[PDB]
Design a protein around this ligand. Structure first.
Ligand SMILES: *[C@@H]1O[C@H](CO)[C@@H](O[C@@H]2O[C@H](CO)[C@@H](O[C@@H]3O[C@H](CO[C@H]4O[C@H](CO)[C@@H](O)[C@H](O)[C@@H]4O)[C@@H](O)[C@H](O[C@H]4O[C@H](CO)[C@@H](O[C@@H]5O[C@H](CO)[C@H](O)[C@H](O)[C@H]5O)[C@H](O)[C@@H]4O)[C@@H]3O)[C@H](O)[C@H]2NC(C)=O)[C@H](O)[C@H]1NC(C)=O
Ligand SMILES: *[C@@H]1O[C@H](CO)[C@@H](O[C@@H]2O[C@H](CO)[C@@H](O[C@@H]3O[C@H](CO[C@H]4O[C@H](CO)[C@@H](O)[C@H](O)[C@@H]4O)[C@@H](O)[C@H](O[C@H]4O[C@H](CO)[C@@H](O[C@@H]5O[C@H](CO)[C@H](O)[C@H](O)[C@H]5O)[C@H](O)[C@@H]4O)[C@@H]3O)[C@H](O)[C@H]2NC(C)=O)[C@H](O)[C@H]1NC(C)=O
Ligand SMILES: *[C@@H]1O[C@H](CO)[C@@H](O)[C@H](O)[C@H]1NC(C)=O
Ligand SMILES: [Ca+2]
Ligand SMILES: [Ca+2]
Ligand SMILES: [Ca+2]
Ligand SMILES: [Ca+2]
Ligand SMILES: [Ca+2]
Ligand SMILES: [Ca+2]
Ligand code: NA
Ligand code: NA
Lengths: 275, 280
C-alpha cells in the first residue's frame, strides 16, 4: 500500500513480550523507494539463540539489553533496503527466564535512491535502466536524457532516424552526430533548408575534415552527396576540406551516406546569405 | 498547486528569443521541499552584461550567466545540479536590445527542467544544530517525505514545540522483579522534579529489596538531605529521608503495596541511584 512511515510495537508494548512467540510484520513502503529504520529491551545471548529479533537478503538477528556489553545489542543505527519491501521478524523461545529465577520488547520506526547515483555493481547486467550519456536522481523514480536531438523513444535508455531536421533561418551551424568524436555509421540522412525566397547562400567549410576515403576510387565507403535546387552537385569524402561555393538558389537538400564501421572524425559546416 | 516536474522554455522556443524582453518564471514546488534544476544557446560575454539569465534560490543569489555550450571563457553553465534552500524557485531571463554582435546577426534560447526533491533536516546540520530555527531534537530525529517530526522517552511525548524532550505523572509497574533507576543514570539527575513511582503487588506477598552502586544524592553532613530528599512511603506511611554517597542497606517491606517519592533540588551535581526488587 501507501506507507509514509509508521510505528511497530512489539506486541503488548510496553508490557513485556509474551514468551513462545514468532510474529512477522512486513513493511511495504511505496514501490520504487528505500525504507529507513531506527529505535530494545530483550534477553541477551551469544548468537541470540535464547531470544532474537530477526530482521531483513538478510540484515541481522540480535537480542540483548541496550546498555549491556557482550550481549549483541543492536542500537539505533540506520540500515536502508535495496528495494520497496522490508521484513521484520520476532522470535522469543519458551523462556523469558533464561538464566532463570525469573523484557519489555522493542518499539521502532520505519520510513528512495536512483541507480544513476553509483551503478551498484554493473551497468549492463542488472535490468538495464542505465544510460550511455546521463540520467537524474529524483524522488519518484528515475528517467533519462541524452545528447541533444531526438528524445530517445519510450525506453529512455538508448539515446537515439534522420528524416527531416528543419531549419528556415538565414545563417546556421550544422555538425554530424557527435563531433569531433567518431561519426555514427549506417545512416541515410537528409538535412533540408528552405530560406526566405529571394536569396542565395554563401558556404564556408571547417577542419579537420574526416571521412574515410579511397584514393583509387573516390568515396566507396562513405559518401557526402549534396542536392542543390533538386539536382546533384557533389560526392565528397576524404580528410582535407573542399573549397567554398555559392548556391544561387533559395532552397537545397543535404544527405549523408556513411559506412557500417566508423574510425574517422567527421565534418562541420557554416552557411550564410547574400542578396 | 501540484507540480511534480516541468520544463521552462525561453518564450518562442526553438525559434530565437525576441530582444527587449525580461520574463520571470517562478517554480512553487510543495512547501518544505527543495527544487533541482539542470539543462543553453545564448550570447557569451565577459560578465554576462549583454544578455544573461539571472537565477536564485529562496532568498539568495545563485548566479547570472550566459554563453554557448562548447565555448570556453564564456562563463558557460552546462548541466550541473543546484539545490535550493527552500520550496520556491526563481528564474529570470534577460535579453538586451542587441543580440547582433560581430555584424553577424544571431541564438535558439533555453529549455530547462526542474524537480521537487524533499529535504530532511535530520540528514545534516548546516553550521550548527542550536542556531537554526525550531531545533527539532536533542537526541535523534526522523527523515521523512514532507519534513521531519520528533519523539522522546517512551513515556511522555514532548509537548507542543516537539523540540525539547523533557514529567513523572505515574510510571506504573505490576511485575514481580524489576529494575528502577533515577532518570538518566549513571549520569547526573535532573533537579526540580516531584516524582511518584508506586507498585502494588498481588496480595499475599512481601518484598525483598537490594540497592546497587555507586549510590549518589547530594547531601549535607551536619543535617541530612537539605538539597535533595529521597522520601519513601511504605503501606501509606513514611519510612525514610535518605541522601549521601554510600549505598543504603537491604530491606524487607512487609506489605503488598508501597509508594516512592523524590524531592529534587534545583542544581544537580551527583549521579543518581539504581535498585532491584524481588518477592517472598
Ligand atoms: C530532403 O527533404 C526535402 C524536403 O522538402 C525533399 O524535397 C521534397 O521532395 C518531395 C518528394 O516527394 C516533395 O513532395 C511532393 O513532390 C511532388 C512533386 O511532383 C512531381 O513528382 C511526383 C513524384 O514524386 C509526380 O507524381 C508528379 O506528377 C510530379 O511529377 C509535389 O507534387 C507535392 O506537392 C505538395 O507540396 C507541399 C507539401 O510539401 C504542399 O503544401 C505546401 O507546402 C509548402 C512548404 O513545403 C508551402 O508552405 C505551400 O504554401 C504549401 O501549399 C502542396 O500543397 C502540395 O500538395 C510535394 O511537394 C516535396 O515538395 C519536396 N520539398 C520541397 C520541394 O520543399 C527532398 O526530396 C529530400 N531528399 C531526399 C529524400 O533525398
Ligand atoms: C503516588 O501515587 C499513589 C497512587 O497509587 C497515591 O496514592 C493515592 O492517593 C489518593 C488520595 O487522593 C487515593 O485516591 C482516593 O483515596 C480515597 C481516600 O478517601 C479519604 O481521603 C479523601 C481525600 O483524599 C477524602 O475525601 C475521603 O473522605 C476519605 O477520608 C479513596 O476513598 C478513593 O477510592 C477510590 O479508589 C479508586 C480510584 O483510585 C476507584 O476505582 C477503582 O480503581 C482500581 C484501580 O485503580 C480498580 O480498578 C477498582 O476496580 C476501581 O473500582 C474507587 O472506586 C474509589 O472510588 C481513592 O482511592 C488513591 O487511591 C491513592 N492510590 C493508591 C492508594 O494506590 C499517592 O498519594 C501518590 N503520591 C504523591 C503524588 O506524592
Ligand atoms: C546465571 O544464573 C543466575 C540466574 O539465576 C545468575 O545470577 C548468574 O549470575 C548467571 N550465571 C553467570 C552470569 O555466569
Ligand atoms: Ca524469551
Ligand atoms: Ca528515484
Ligand atoms: Ca571509417
Ligand atoms: Ca538579444
Ligand atoms: Ca525532513
Ligand atoms: Ca543536589
Ligand atoms: Na562525426
Ligand atoms: Na540520577
Amino acid at each position: 500500500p501507501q506507507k509514509l512511515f509508521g510505528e511497530v510495537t512489539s506486541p503488548l508494548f510496553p508490557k513485556p513480550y509474551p514468551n513462545n512467540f514468532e510474529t512477522t510484520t512486513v513493511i511495504t513502503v511505496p514501490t520504487g523507494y528505500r525504507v529507513k529504520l531506527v529505535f530494545f529491551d530483550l534477553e541477551p545471548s551469544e548468537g541470540c539463540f535464547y531470544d532474537y529479533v530477526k530482521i531483513s537478503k538478510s540484515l541481522g538477528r540480535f537480542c540483548g539489553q541496550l546498555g549491556s556489553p557482550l550481549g549483541n545489542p543492536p542500537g539505533k543505527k540506520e540500515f536502508m533496503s535495496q528495494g520497496n519491501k522490508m521484513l521484520l521478524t520476532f522470535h522469543t523461545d519458551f523462556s523469558n527466564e533464561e538464566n532463570g529465577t525469573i523484557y519489555k520488547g522493542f518499539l521502532a520506526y520505519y520510513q528512495d535512491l536512483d541507480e544513476c547515483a553509483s551503478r551498484s555493481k554493473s551497468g549492463e547486467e542488472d535490468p538495464q535502466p542505465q544510460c550511455q550519456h546521463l540520467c537524474h536522481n529524483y524522488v519518484g523514480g528515475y528517467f533519462c536524457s541524452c545528447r541533444p536531438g531526438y528524445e530517445l523513444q519510450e525506453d529512455t535508455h538508448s539515446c537515439q532516424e534522420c528524416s527531416s531536421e528543419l531549419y528556415t533561418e538565414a545563417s546556421g551551424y550544422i555538425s554530424s552526430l557527435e563531433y569531433p568524436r567518431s561519426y555514427p555509421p549506417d545512416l541515410r540522412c537528409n538535412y533540408s533548408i528552405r530560406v526566405e525566397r529571394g536569396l542565395t547562400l554563401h558556404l564556408k567549410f571547417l577542419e579537420p575534415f574526416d571521412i574515410d576515403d579511397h584514393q583509387q576510387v573516390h568515396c566507396p565507403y562513405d559518401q557526402l552527396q549534396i542536392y542543390a535546387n533538386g539536382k546533384n552537385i557533389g560526392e565528397f569524402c576524404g580528410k582535407q576540406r573542399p573549397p567554398d561555393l555559392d548556391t544561387s538558389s533559395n532552397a537545397v537538400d543535404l544527405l549523408f551516406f556513411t559506412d557500417e564501421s566508423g574510425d574517422s572524425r567527421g565534418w562541420k559546416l557554416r552557411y550564410t546569405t547574400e542578396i
